[PDB]
Amino acid sequence: SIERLGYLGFAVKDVPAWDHFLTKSVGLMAAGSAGDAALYRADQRAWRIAVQPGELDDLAYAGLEVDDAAALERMADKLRQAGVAFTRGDEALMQQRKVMGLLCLQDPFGLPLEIYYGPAEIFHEPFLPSAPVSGFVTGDQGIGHFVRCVPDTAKAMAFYTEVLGFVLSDIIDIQMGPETSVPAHFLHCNGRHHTIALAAFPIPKRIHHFMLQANTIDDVGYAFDRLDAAGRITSLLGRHTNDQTLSFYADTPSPMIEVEFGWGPRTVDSSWTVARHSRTAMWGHKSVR
Template sequence: MSVKSLGYMGFAVKDVSAWRSFLTQKLGLMDAGVTDDGALFRIDSRAWRIAVQQGEADDLAYAGYEVADAAGLTQMTEKLRQAGIEVVTGDVELAKRRGVMGLISFADPFGLPLEIYYGASEVFEKPFMPGAAVSGFLTGEQGLGHFVRCVPDSEKALAFYTQVLGFQLSDVIDMKMGPDVTVPAYFLHCNERHHTLAIAAFPLPKRIHHFMLEVSSLNDVGFAFDRLDADGLITSTLGCHTNDHMVSFYAATPSGVEVEYGWAARTIDRSWVVARHDSPSMWGHKSVRNKA
């Protein structure tokens, strides 16, 4: 039993207004209004995918993983409790705020609040209208995208996400952090998206290094690059990753957490075998900050 996809993310930030402008005018998300969960944003037919609420953390506040139905939620609840994880069944009010039929709440081994839910709200009658030039985002069975979780003990986190939540290892990249320092990054999938989650013991103050959105065309990437570059927000140049082959760039959000914006990642199929890589990129992804 495994979760099926990353369904939504919620951020707690100091400047909600700056995030609203960033997500809509720079990344092309659709403003879906304000609720008790904060400002909501769409990238497809779902009522929302990203929420931004007022908070001092300037970080990811929670993430929601989707299962197919009530039976799947019950199975995941039992699996978590058998693993000794404290699980709270979401009440009617929380389910209403999230726009789902049912959910549970718990935390990963290093304190990131997680939710598993089923029955998300679809709003096909309200077509997705991007806030900036973008032809569309890749979601569907692949879910929202991915994020890279920063943890002090990657082996402990890896055990939780694979043995309890059911993720599977796609591959490993040995990240060279210095002349004599290498940190392995583990890339995990729960559907055909190459990775919905990556785990690494990066010495960073945030819960995540970045989150990723995948768009429908190379031009979408290029137009977004120009919009963000005009404001000096690019943190790494266009490049192509060694493992998922995505063509992407990275930019700074108003909270310092980065966003990866990419296109054309390869997907997982039945013939997939685990591999390791010595470098994260075949070409590009040169740090802009280091040149400043």
């Protein structure tokens, strides 16, 4: 029922660092501010990522998009049936988020989630990257994806699939140690191999990282050099086993939260069949320190 991931809001300790990070390194376009939140664009939407000050230094919320007013009421019906508490956003929030309607709730482990519809677009202000990137792959596949750290994956799974309508793509047993592995569950709600992944990681953050997809392989190559120069590279280039995304990882100015910049993944559809992988990379992704 949730169609795609449309926006992300972060509450960070270093807004200037995050502003420089998202623009000069990642290539996003600065798009003014809404309240105490600095806004950034990746395409035609008024904003895709918001950054406001806060001790959290973590994702503050995520906007899940539906296609119309009716779909939103249908989600209210689901949440209601599932016993999930939610509050319809008021005019002020709608104004702040620049959406036509929204429902505010939280996932089973405290992550604020906003289900909306009717997002604002500004085609009269053509997207202009702040760094050399031909463009970002969004559209029907949403802004990208993020890995949600959860203390109980089964509990998380039931919510995201049974309540939100996400669908399991596959599972990767991410090796933590010699005899330790974390079964990461990748979920989709559209063509993007996965929009949200759930994993019981021993990390104190709401998310492990968020991912952005560029149009070309060179976009990623160039972006790697930029973040390397910034001294934030955490992994070498590589290609995943499940989505076949070619990317690299880097630290965001927020401790223990990374960003993934990738290209050319594999998209899902009706015929998708669940599989299991023992590695996150078919090649590359060597961890960097």
